[PDB]
Amino acid sequence: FTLIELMIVIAIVGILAAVALPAYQDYTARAQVSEAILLAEGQKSAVTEYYLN
Amino acid sequence: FTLIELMIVIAIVGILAAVALPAYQDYTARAQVSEAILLAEGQKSAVTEYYLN
Numbered sequence: 215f216t217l218i219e220l221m222i223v224i225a226i227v228g229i230l231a232a233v234a235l236p237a238y239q240d241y242t243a244r245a246q247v248s249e250a251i252l253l254a255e256g257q258k259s260a261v262t263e264y265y266l267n
Numbered sequence: 268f269t270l271i272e273l274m275i276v277i278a279i280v281g282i283l284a285a286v287a288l289p290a291y292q293d294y295t296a297r298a299q300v301s302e303a304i305l306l307a308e309g310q311k312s313a314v315t316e317y318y319l320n
Binding site for chain 1: 278
């Protein structure tokens with residue numbers, strides 16, 4: 215008898231595929247969301263520039 | 268498993284290269300555009316000088 219050793223595999227086979235993937239496509243999103251933010255960084259002072267002058 | 272840690276790098280690798288570079292070559296331009304303006308500063312009074320006398 216070994217099957218419970220196979221059972222535990224197929225328990226490992228059914229993986230979670232952690233929410234630490236989709237919370238980190240949401241924070242990979244935070245990466246390229248930031249890529250949008252880093253654009254905004256340029257306009258921060260330029261928009262400001264119009265706003266002040 | 269770590270790959271999403273590599274994913275997020277290659278999301279950082281693809282950088283924005285912010286428009287705060289080309290809006291600030293346009294305002295680096297404003298620097299040496301100003302370098303043209305600072306020339307004009309001399310002629311402001313000299314052109315004026317002819318204009319008044």
